[PDB]
Each structure stands twice: as structure tokens, then as C-alpha cells.
Design a protein around this ligand. Sequence first.
Ligand code: ATP
Ligand code: ADP
Ligand code: ADP
Ligand code: MG
Ligand code: MG
Ligand code: MG
Lengths: 177, 456, 456, 51, 51, 509, 86
Amino acid sequence: AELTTLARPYAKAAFEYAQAHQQLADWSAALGVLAAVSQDDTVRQLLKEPQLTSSAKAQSLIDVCGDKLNAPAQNFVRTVAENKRLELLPTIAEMYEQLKAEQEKSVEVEVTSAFTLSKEQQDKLAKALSARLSREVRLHASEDASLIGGVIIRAGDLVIDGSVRGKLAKLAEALKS
Amino acid sequence: SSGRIVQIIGAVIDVEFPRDAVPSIYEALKVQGVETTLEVQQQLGDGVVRSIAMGSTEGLKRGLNVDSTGAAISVPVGKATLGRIMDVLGNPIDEAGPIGEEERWGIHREAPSYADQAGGNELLETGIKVIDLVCPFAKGGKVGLFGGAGVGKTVNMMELIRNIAIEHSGYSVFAGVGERTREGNDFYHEMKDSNVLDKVALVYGQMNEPPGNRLRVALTGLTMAEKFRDEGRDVLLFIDNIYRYTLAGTEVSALLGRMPSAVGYQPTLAEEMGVLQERITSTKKGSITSIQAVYVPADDLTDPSPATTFAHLDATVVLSRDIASLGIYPAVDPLDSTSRQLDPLVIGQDHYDTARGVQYVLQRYKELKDIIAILGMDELSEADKLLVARARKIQRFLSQPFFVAEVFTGSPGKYVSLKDTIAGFKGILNGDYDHLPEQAFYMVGGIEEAVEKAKK
Amino acid sequence: SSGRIVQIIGAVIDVEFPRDAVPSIYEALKVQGVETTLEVQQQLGDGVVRSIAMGSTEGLKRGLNVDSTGAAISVPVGKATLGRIMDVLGNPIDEAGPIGEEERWGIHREAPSYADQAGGNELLETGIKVIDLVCPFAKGGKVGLFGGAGVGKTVNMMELIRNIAIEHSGYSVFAGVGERTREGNDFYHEMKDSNVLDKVALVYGQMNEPPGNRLRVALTGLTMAEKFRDEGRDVLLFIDNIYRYTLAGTEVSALLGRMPSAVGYQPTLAEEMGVLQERITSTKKGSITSIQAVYVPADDLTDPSPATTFAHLDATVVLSRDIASLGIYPAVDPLDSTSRQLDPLVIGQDHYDTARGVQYVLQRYKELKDIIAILGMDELSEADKLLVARARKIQRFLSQPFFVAEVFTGSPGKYVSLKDTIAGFKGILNGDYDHLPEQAFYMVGGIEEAVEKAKK
Amino acid sequence: AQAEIEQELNSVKDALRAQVGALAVTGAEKILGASIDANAHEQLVSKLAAE
Amino acid sequence: AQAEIEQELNSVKDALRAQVGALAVTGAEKILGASIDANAHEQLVSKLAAE
Amino acid sequence: LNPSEISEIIKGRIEKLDVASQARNEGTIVSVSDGIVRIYGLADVMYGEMIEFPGGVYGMALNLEQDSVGAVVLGEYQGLAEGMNAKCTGRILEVPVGPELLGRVVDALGNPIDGKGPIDAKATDAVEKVAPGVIWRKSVDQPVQTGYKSVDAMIPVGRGQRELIIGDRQIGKTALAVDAIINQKDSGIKCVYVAIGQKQSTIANVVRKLEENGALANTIVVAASASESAALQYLAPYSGCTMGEYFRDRGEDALIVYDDLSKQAVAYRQISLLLRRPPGREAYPGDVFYLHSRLLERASRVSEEYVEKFTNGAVTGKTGSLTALPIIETQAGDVSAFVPTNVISITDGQIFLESAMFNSGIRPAVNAGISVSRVGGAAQTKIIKKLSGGIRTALAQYRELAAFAQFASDLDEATRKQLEHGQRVTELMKQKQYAPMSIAEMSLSLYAAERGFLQDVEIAKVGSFEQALISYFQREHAALLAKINEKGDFNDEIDAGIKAGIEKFKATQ
Amino acid sequence: MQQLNPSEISEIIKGRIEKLDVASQARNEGTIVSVSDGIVRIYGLADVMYGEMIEFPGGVYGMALNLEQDSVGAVVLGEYQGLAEG
Ligand SMILES: Nc1ncnc2c1ncn2[C@@H]1O[C@H](COP(=O)(O)OP(=O)(O)OP(=O)(O)O)[C@@H](O)[C@H]1O
Ligand SMILES: Nc1ncnc2c1ncn2[C@@H]1O[C@H](COP(=O)(O)OP(=O)(O)O)[C@@H](O)[C@H]1O
Ligand SMILES: Nc1ncnc2c1ncn2[C@@H]1O[C@H](COP(=O)(O)OP(=O)(O)O)[C@@H](O)[C@H]1O
Ligand SMILES: [Mg+2]
Ligand SMILES: [Mg+2]
Ligand SMILES: [Mg+2]
């Protein structure tokens, strides 16, 4: 079973409560704090001890976060701890943001090129992708010298490759096959 | 409302629906775009249902939308189904266009109550010597043709259809479950060429079809027979292999998350068989006469599937591989075969005494066969030598060439009557034919022809 | 870069590496504080790899640093390996110093292609009567000696190494896979004292060794044989026990996270066997004649390992415990043993008919065993009595004293030509020796010696 | 004989073809790795935005 | 036939050795989607010497 | 050694390069174990779809779990690694098809392994398909001569029938199927031989025997040897079936041999256990019956209407067929094993080979009592149908009679007549390998036995009598053999013609 | 690590966000979580006894046989196909 399989019930419950009560931004901050705090070298050790009870592990994590957890978020941490799932907090935060992004019709697109592209080109790629996908696009542009020229677009599981490296690979496979 | 395909593993598919909108057990679902139907087997919780696909899964993808139909698989019933070939979902699989349906029934139903059960004992003549002697059938009863691979189940079912279905004036249903597609084609052209097709509803689910189809075709054919029974009619129901319904459950059981039982069968073997077999019955409203062919894995009658089947039938006909291996046909075992109708108070003392007489002679011969093979025939008593000769002759007089077997035998087919059968076996038991050679009784219909074959 | 041990369970170790530096499948790794070698079997994800240790794991702990070598286990090959003893990793284990290697080859390779295959049928004489009669060998072909514990496999092989080296002038490669350390010492000193050692390469991974060694020693010996074949030479490849390669795979399979198959075997049983067996072949470049011993667990020839091995061989020699119990050696079973060379177009009609005649007589004698056990020989027909008498003489004439078996009894060894073998059995089948006593054929080499033994 | 002579003859052309194809790909990689600069992206990134 | 292949092989080898440059520049020009003569012949005379 | 030609061949691949942009669905490799690869992100992957990995390596999607995709590699997997990209091709597994494959040796994906050049086929087809339905079929009523009198007389095979060859190791299962392929070189039936889990030198020897007997030009050889991926061994029977179906769908006849379906089942069991699917009756997958039933139901005879519809009227008034000869291996004669039990329950008949008969010198080793054909007389020519009626059941009764009367004192004339005849037919059914008989040769042999001419002949002389009778009719009655061989017809003129020739033979040679 | 237990469904987890102590408030009442092969899994019924009878909608009755740490496994004393999640 993948960590994503185990985190799905919890991320979905947290998302539906946050959505129904208009708290989407509060839970986004709370789950992000819990994901970061539970990954700390001292907290990671404390959560794995065999002598501590589920409620002692939950209270220790709530006391450390304090100000960042409202009554519903504190109740959620006590629920994750009772079911012995505190190791899933980083995955629960990741899956909550995916449900939020899909609800808010938003897409984060990674982009890579051989050498830098202008704002005029980024805004031309952004309107083209937003018109194709029917979503708000956030271009995380970057460079990779492994490309001989052109650009590669990664809109989640969808990939659009217009780079020269991809064309050279197609030719190598065409001649070798 | 609608759900989405979340997982696909072989023939089993998981679909997720809104929690306020989970489809019911046995509910039918439809995939968007692709031409496939799913049946809910289980509700897994959290809005997810586990289902078996009623078609191949090669085109399916995760994330396809699925529509809840609000009901179980519903098939056309009544007069419009006669003279038509159909699949598990009730679609026509012949080029004759849409079915002239007026009503549709769901394939999942409760069995008739204890107060609705029938009580008839009207004897049915089959025209086959061994069956009419030791396995007498009755109208409105259940018959099972037990046997391994290559011993005659389909051939005996075809001879029984010829000697009962054609002459009968009611409706028939023929269900091909996990059958060879070649047998289905030969039978369709046979019913069509014989002008019998207008009396029969044909439902086919062959071996080339997915596990979900083979798991439900028996319920489709039975749903059509139940509509005719509940109208007050007398109906004939034929099932070429009921073992294939159990096997489809074994093939899918482990993918449905069920732990295996003895001999690798599904834990639900006896209940899945009981839920089907208790619907195949005659009631106070109307009657169903049924003949089922039962496959025996590796010829072992103690295998959980065959062993659980005997208790559901009135007449049990057993076919033996050792008899078939000696060129004797029909390859029926008179000692293992039996019927609820073999009672002097149901038939008569003359018939019963002849049947028990034949069985006594063959049972005693079974212990002497091993004696003769090591120490020779000459060491037996004067009574034993004579009895062995009669047993070998009786064993041959059980044989008969069938009209549906002319392509295998070369000789023509013989129909024999109940009185002719009784008289022939009493003659061999009393010693009226001790002078005839052993080869004269092999493949010869009634007793007269045996006297004639001895002269050739 | 380098990784860190994260888990240890028996012979299997999990190591975590940076995501940009994860080692390849079959790549060799070295533990920093002990220099123990590990072979990568699979990549688990998150930079973690699973490996098998090529040595003892006692004293290892979690958190130790591990170095990736960038290549698979590489062993020395060529002329420098002749007259030397090596371990699984190619290190010298004979105390004679470092190997004067010119190059090293990785132990993992693909089998030669379909277009590289050789069509050789040239007969190889073994000087052993039963083998040359019913199991004729061929140059560049594969032979398997099947047998349970203590039936004759190591003796019957060492007699073949002694007899085949008479006509062969090239090199030999010997791979000791999971067997006795004392027999490796006995064989090394025997060849050293006989001056035969400078034409043989020796590799060992005996029963005392951990699972990783026993699993890869077969590949190390085969890699040396493939170097000599690819140089255009004709070489002999001897594998002490090919079953141990499969068994070492069974000990590790559950630790590799694999679900077990029938009788506890690894699910990869047939693939692990095919990947090794297909490399042991003759090509258009050079030839490999190979002899392999195949252990039979609890004397069961239907066991998955022996059952999967038969299809990989040209000649199959089946040893029996029932035959060895009567005193007959070599304890070969003529009715179970066979060869691809037993064809009229390969060996000629005279040899073929003699071999077929011997098998017909021995088969008919085997059918009478139960009758003879209860009633004795005196009840048989005059034809069966004569056949049983010849069967008993043929069965005894198949025995032969070996030059490696002299220590066990005292009798001198015998080498019998194919011409003398055919002449003896043809005479016994024709009846030319019906007057000589049955004990005159036991342990006598050629047929003329049976005539001299009968004088006493 | 005759068919096998043609079997070898075409196999040699393929052995050469396998090396010439690798060299032609390497040549194209070296040419593009020198011929491409900022003047090419205004003719490639702009092209992709229409695709 | 094997002797003819051994004797004739260098005659075709020197012909393909000349064609590698033409295959490389035409292949790069296809991949670039625009004329390459102005930025490929100086690459051919400097890189082809290593093939 | 032609220059410029090689260049233009390369220019043809450069000219047609796909220089345009493509929209694709993609994932990343998570783990690589025993030929199984796990991937994240392939949202639109379909079940059984081809996955494209770096360096032209291909896989197939088999487990579409909610959070992961389980794929099997269609070749060597050891070059794959964590973090590599997995791509998606909107195509189901397809292989090349057509007459261009005749006389060639190919892998399970259709790539040539014979080194005889490229296969210029002009048509590809899907490896996994559903067989033609009940209404599109036609009854089997045309013969497939194997060339062996024991098989062609007692266990006949028709065009579109499925006949199982079953027995233990080393008793002639491959010899029977390869001789049946050799006999089709003049029949007009195309052949396919599928080798599953065999060693490459055994495959090369079968191909050499097909070529030495002149049968290779009419045969397609599909190889998935013992060292190849379990996925290729699992797919090979379906690839070969697809190549045979090309002829069936176009109004032509084909024959296919699966040299080991028990090795295909072992390859499928490996993949299924490595995908972690729950095991059954002998660790075999739950759907091991459906593995073979989905393959074997494609071998069939299709009606003129089906061929006319498939070819869009280009072929008319002709039926098409695919006949199958699957092989199964048993352990010490045990038929109760899960795989043997399944296949015997699917085919239109079986041919049982017995090791005791094989050791006793009856070399075709066919047990007439256990072997049977479900098509019977409809799969025979008029002459063989009449001359072989009842021989199978008569031999089955002779084997029992020979055991029952073995130690008893002298019996009646009916018993002596049956025993003496059964001994002669038993010696007659013996035949050598690579020596097939025509309809006329089998007919003379059957006629001399059933019409009583062998009653004066010694058992030890039946083989010599048959060989001499055939050689005599070949020299002095050649026009009669040519008339019998046109369609296997029979009438009083041919019956009297054979009678006169056999009488003259026995009275003068 | 371990697979999802029967109480690990979003509707149950969402209820503990509203009222942490949602269960044990009505120890005699529970909710159906899953239905399959005549077996019903229920969340709640904290005070059910081993072998006690459970009442479902429509006059259908079951018997409590698996009192696990997170849920109750009950078998139906009649037809189960009419029961549903929730
Ligand atoms: N008709 C025959 N007459 C004589 N010998 C025969 C005959 N048929 C087969 N044989 C011989 O018997 C052996 C049968 O081998 P074959 O490969 O055909 O059997 P198999 O069952 O397929 O064996 P395997 O299990 O190894 O595949 C061969 O040596 C073959 O030459
Ligand atoms: N009564 C019979 N007479 C002749 N042959 C028969 C008879 N019953 C079965 N057979 C033989 O068996 C096959 C048909 O039997 P079938 O009904 O298919 O058996 P099963 O249904 O038990 O598999 C044919 O090969 C046929 O020759
Ligand atoms: N004539 C003989 N007398 C006694 N033992 C013999 C004789 N010939 C061979 N052997 C037996 O041969 C065996 C050779 O190895 P074997 O036990 O068969 O194979 P393995 O040890 O490899 O499983 C020896 O253990 C020995 O007991
Ligand atoms: Mg049947
Ligand atoms: Mg030994
Ligand atoms: Mg074979």
C-alpha cells in the first residue's frame, strides 16, 4: 500500500471540512506546519518512541505548533494520532493541496529550456496553456543545459516537448530500430 | 448520480461514487464512452463499490466516469425471447435486429417459499435403455448428467432434447454456459433446420467470454424460464455446464478479497450453488423440468464442486470413463447412478426387481474381474462362470446407437421403449439368451436385433 | 557516491544511496570496514536497493558505509586460469599467488543468438556400455546425470572425465556448485599428481559457503568456458551439481519479497534455469561439450527442479535406487534414459535396432514383475519364460567395473568399444548365449569375458 | 549456398548501417550544438506556442 | 563469396565515409526546421575528421 | 556491397522524421524487481497498453491500481532504473501479419531472428482479440491429413478443429505435430509453429527438419526461447494465433502448433505471482483456465458471410479456417493436475501418447482407448470414412480382450477372430517418423486389413506386406492411386479395382 | 505501513473534526461501513455483546460475531442484499 493510499481518507476529510466552513487557507497553513514540524530530527524521534501513548504524542505535537492550530485542526491531529497515522502528515498536506488546486481551477506548470526565455515568451506560453487546459497556469520556469535548444512543458502528468534533445532521441531510435 | 473508475485488476473494477449516492449490491453500472457494464458485488465503504466487468477491460482507464442505473442487470422476458439468441445482458447476438420486448426482469431473485413447492411424480420416458431402467425421470423434476471430460454429457443432453423438447408442446430454454462456440453453432442450425427454434429461447455465454459473463448467464436463462413458469406454463430448462458458474466464482473470488477454502474453491461454494439451484424448481403456479450437465474435475466425484451438487437433484446419472474406454456407449454406470422415482410405489415391482437384478449381477462381477485377471476363469465356480458371462452380456446390452451420434458411430440411431427395455434385461437375467455370443448385444437397440446380430 | 546499510536479514542486505547515484541491477558493491562484496538484485525505490552478500554477514550492522564499483562481478579469463583454483569472485584459493590475467569479464551475459547456433551430430564414444548403447553422446552437446542421494552421479561423472580426456586435446572448465570440499581436494591432487592439471580451470563454491556464493559460482565457471569457446576452441564444461544453483535461489527467494510457488520454490524457477542453461551451448565460433549432475530431491523425478531441467539437455541419463540395490553399477535405467542421437540417420540401423530390441525386452520383463512376485516364473508361457531369461542376462550385461570404482571393491576397470557393445547385446537378443549361466554376464566388460567367466 | 550468400551480403550492409546511423546522429548533435543560439529560440519557443 | 567481401569492403567503406557529412547536415537542417548551410559547412570540415 | 544504396536507405528515415510537436501522457519509474516495473502518473493508460521506456525498451500495463501502475517488460529489464520517464502510446499490442512471414523465424513481437533481411509485410494486427461469435461460424466438414494412418483413421482432424497432443516427456509429441506441418506443403494450408520456453538449439533443429523436408516455405516460426522474458513467453501463442487468423479472415486455411501450453502457463504464473495477485490450486493464477480458453476459441471455421463481410466483398463463396494442435506435458501420466485438466476440457478432441506403448516399440504411441475426435467422420474423405468406421472402438475392445483371455484355455471362433484381427491392426498402426502416407496409401493399408486380406499374413510380416503392396500399386496401378488422391472418393468401381489389385499381389509376389 | 482499517473512511474522520467524542454518546447505535457476501461491518455499537442480535432498517436482523478494536463484524439472519453503507 502506497503512502497516498493511506493518506487519502484524512486529506479528503480535512478538505471537505475546510471547504464547507470557508477555512481553505487556514487548513493550508495548519497542515503545512504539521508536515514541517513532524519531519524535524527531534520531533521525528519523539513520535517513534514505544513508551508514549497516542494522546501524549498528539499533545506534544499540538503544544509545539500552538498558535497555528485552531480547535478543528487540534481535533484532527488527535484523530490522526489515535489511528496511529502521524507518519502520514507530510502526505496528508500534499494531498490536501492537490484537492485545493483542483477546486480553485489552478495548475502549477514546470518549464525547462536550454537558455533563458523572455517575459514575452513566458506570457505567450501561459495564455496558450490556459486556453488548452481551461485553468489558471503558474509557470515555474528554469534552465537545463542538457537541452540543445527549445523548451519542455510539464503540466502535471501531461508533457509537451518541443526541445532539440527530444528530436535527436527520435532520430537515434528511428535509425536503431 | 455518477462515479469514477479508481482501480482495474483483471476482470474486477473499483468505482467511487458520492457517499450520499453509493449504488446497491448487485446494482448495474455503465462506463462513460466505452461500451462496458459493471455489477456491484460489494460496497467497500467510503463511497467505493467493487464490481465485476460484463465485458473485456483492455480499453478501460482510471478516471472514466460511470453512471449508476439504480437497479440490477435487467433482461427481456416473455414470448419475444422465443427463437432468439442472446448474451448475458439480454442483447440479441443474432443478426435479426432488436427484441420485441414488453417487460424486463432483474436477474437477482429470492427462491420460491416452502409453502409454494410442488409434489408431482409423473414418470417421463427418455427412450434410452440405461436411463429408463435405473434412472427414471419425472415431469417437473431436476436431472444431473455427471461426468469428466470426453464421456458424453453434451451427446446425452442432445439425445434427451430430441426425445423430449421436440415432442413437448410447452416452451423451452437452452443455456450454453462456458460451452464451445462450435457446439452452440451446430445446435442453433440444428434447432433452425428441425423447425423447433420457434419454441426455444437460446442464451449463450461461451469460454471466450469474460468471468463476469460466465458468472451471470445461468441467472439470465433462469429469469426467462421463471417468467414462463409464473404464467402457469410447463417449461423445459437445459444447462450444458453448471460447473462453469462455480469456476467463474473461483476465478474472481480471490480478486474480490475472499480467502480460499479446500481444493482452492471460493468459501461461498455451497451458498452460491444453493442461491442458484433453489430457483430451478417446479411450484404450485407452474412447472420447470430441468436437465443440467455437471463436469467432474479429473473424474473425481469427491471433488467439492460435484460433491455439493448431488443434494440439489432428483435424478443423478453418472457417466464412467472406464466404460467409455471400452468402446461402450452410452457410457453410464448402473451402480453409481440413481433416481428418487426408483420405488415400487411410484413405478411398479416388475421394473424395480429388474433394475435391482441387473445391479446385483454387475456388483458381484466387479469383485470377480480382478480374480479372473490373476488366476484365470477356470478356477471360478459353475455358478460364477455363468454369472460372469451374463454380466459381460448385460454390460454390452446397456449400449445403444443414438441419432445424434451417427457421425461418431457410423450406424443408424435406435429409440427403445420402457417395456422393451424391461423385457430385454429380464431375458438375459432369466437365461433366455445364454446361447448367444457376447458381441451380439453390443450397439443394437432392443432385444430382437441382438438375436439377429448373432447370425452375422 | 556511497550508501548506508538500512536493513540486514540473513544473506540479504538493503542499502540506501543518494537519488542521483543509485547502482544498477547486478552491480557489485563493497562494505567499507570489512570489504565484503554485495550484488544488487532489485531497486526498491526512494534510493534503496536490495542485494545478496558474497560472503558471511555475521558482524555487519546498520549504518555502515557501502561503495558502488560501477560494474558487475568481474572474473579473470583466458590461459592464466588453467591449473589454478578460484572462488566465486575470481580470487585464487590454491595459495599459488596472484593470477597472471590479461583481461576480466563480467559474470552476467545474454545467451548466443538464434543465428549463432551449431547443428553438430558427431558421435562421442564414452567406453561405457549402457551409455553408448541407449544414451549416445555427441560432441558440442549437453548431458545430464539425474539421481537421488548415493546412486552414482559423482563416480559416473569422474569415469566420464577420465574416458573423454583420452580423445580430447583442448581445455576443460570445472565448476563446483554447492558440493563436498573433500572431493574438490581429492580431484585437485589427483590431477596434480597425474600432470593433467595444466589444461583444467577449477572454480569452487561448496556446501560450507553462504547462499550468495552457491548462487553465482556457476556463472563464474561458465564465464571462463565462454572465453575459450569464443577464442575458437573446443572445450569441456563440467558442473558438479546444477541443482544447487536453483536451491541457493530458493533459500533467498522469500527474503527478496517474492510470493512462493508450488512446493515452496521461487516463482522465477524456470527463468533462472533458462538464463544459465542457454549460455551453455556450442556456436559457429567454437564448441562446448557439457556434462552436468542433476540432484533428484527425495528420489522424486516429478519435483519442479528436475522436471524443469530435462528440456535443456541432448542426452538424459537417469540413475535408479532400485537398480543400485540389486548390485548393478552404473545404475542407469535404460527405459527412463534417452538421447537425441538415438536416431537411424545418426547412428545407423544396426545400433538403433539393437538398442530398440534391448528396450523392448526390458519393458516386457517390467510388465511381468507383479505376476512373478505372487505366482513365480513357472506359471509364465514358454515365450515369456525365454524373454525373462534374456531380460535377466541383458540387465546383468549392462553392468561394468570402472577405473575410478577400483578402490570400492578391488576389481580392475574395463573400457568397452561401441563395436563390442553392439555385438554383445545383438548376440544375447538373437539367442547366441542362451546356454551360459546368468551370473556370467555380471561385471565383465566385453562379451568374450562372459564366455570365459562361465568356465568357472 | 546461393541464398546464404545473399543472407551474408545484406547482413554486412546492416552492420555498416548501424555504425553510419550513429555517426550521422552524432554529426547532427555537434552541428546543432554550435548552430543554435538566442536567434533560434525566437523561431522555436514561438513555434511551440502555436502547437 | 567471403573472399570477395573481404577484398571489396574498403571500396564501399570510403564511399560511406564521404556521405556521413551530407547525412549529418541534412538531418540537422530537418531538426532545426530552417536553412543551415551558413552555420554547418565550417562544422563539417572541423568535426568530420574525427569520424 | 552497394554504396549510395545504404545512404538513400538512411535518407528515407531522415526524410520522414516526425519533426512536429506531440501531446503525451507520462509517468516515472518507482521500482524495478523481477521483470516488473512500478510507475506513478500514467492517468490515461489503458489495460494491456504499450508503455515506452528510454532506449526503445517497451512494457505492458497489467495492474492499474488507484495510486500505482504495474507493468511487465517486453524484453531485458536490467537496464531500467528508478527515476526514468515512462511514456504512453495510444496503441494496443500489435504484430506484423501477411504472407511475407512465410519461411521466416521471428520473435514474439514479430522481429526477424533468422538474419534473412526485413519482412516487407503490409499489415499489422492486435495480439489480443475476441473470437468470431456463434452466428458467424460453419460446421467442420473438411479434412486435415496428418499423414499418419493411426491418427487420420481413428482420431481425424478437420479444418477449424482443435486437437490436443498430450503425454509425458520424450515420447513423440513434437514429432507428431512437425510431421503434420510437413504434410501440408501441397495441401494449400498455411502453417505456424510456436515454440514456448524451448532451448534455441532445439528450435534451430526443428527449422532444419522443416527445410530438409521442403515444408519451411509454407511455415511461420514464432520463437520465445527459455532465456527470454516471461512476458514474451506468455504472449507468443497469441502473436502466432494473430498471424494464423490473417488467412482465416480472408477465406484461406491455416494450421497452428503450440509446442508447449504448459510452459506458457508457467510463464503466466511467474508474472502473476510477481504482480502479487493471489494464487490458486497449484500456485497458478485464478484465471489460468481463461488464459487457454481465450487462445483456443480463436481456432475455428468461419462462414462465407463472415469472409465476405471482412473482405468488403473482395472474396466471395469461400469459407476460412484456423486449425490448432496444442501440446501439453504430464508428470508420470498424472492428468489430475490443474493445467492438463483445463485444456482437455476445451479442445475438440485429444491424442494421448503412452510411454509403455512407446517403450514396447509402438512408436506413434497413440492410446486408441483414451484418444478421441469430437468431429469424427465429418472430418474424413469418403474412402477413409467408410474403411475406418468402428476401428477405434474395435481396438479399444481388443486391448481388453487380450488382457481378459491372457491365461484362459482355448476359446470359441468369435473370440479367436476378434483377437487375431486386433493383433494385425495393432501391428499395422506402427509408422516411422518423417514418412507420411497419402489418402491412397492409407486406403490400401486400411482395405487390406478390414476386408480380411491380412488373415493369412504373419504378425511379424504385416509391415513388409504393407510396404510391398504400396510399392506394387505405385508401379502397376498408378492411375488408380491418382484417382483416389483427387478427393478421396469411393464407389463400386474403385472398391473392385482395389480388390483385383490386392488379389493379384498376394497370388503372384 | 498497515492497510486502512474499517473506521478509516472520510465520513467518520470528518465527524471527529466536528465533535472529537462523537462515538460513545450512543453506545447502543452504530453505522454500516461495508456490505459483502452476507457479512456487514458496522462502526459503533460499543456495548454490543458477543452473539447479541442487531436490528437493521426494514425488519432485517443480524448477529454480532467479530468484536474488533475498531469495528463490529455481523452476519445477517436473512437476506443481506437490501442493506447499504450509511
Ligand atoms: N514414429 C516414430 N517412430 C520412431 N521413433 C519415433 C517416432 N516418433 C517419435 N520418435 C522418436 O522418439 C523421440 C520423441 O521425441 P519428441 O521430441 O518428439 O518427444 P517429446 O514428447 O516432444 O519430447 P520432449 O518432452 O523432450 O519435448 C525422438 O527420439 C523421436 O525421434
Ligand atoms: N454415445 C456415444 N456414441 C459414440 N461416441 C460417443 C458417444 N458419447 C460420446 N461419444 C464420443 O465422445 C465425443 C462426444 O462426447 P461429448 O458429449 O462431447 O462428451 P463430454 O460432454 O462428456 O465431453 C465424440 O468424440 C464422440 O465420438
Ligand atoms: N560400486 C559402488 N559401490 C558403492 N557406492 C557406489 C558405487 N558406485 C557409485 N557409488 C556411489 O556414488 C555416489 C556418487 O555421488 P552421488 O551420491 O550419487 O551424488 P551426490 O553426492 O552428488 O548427490 C557415492 O556417494 C557412492 O556411494
Ligand atoms: Mg461436451
Ligand atoms: Mg555426489
Ligand atoms: Mg517435444
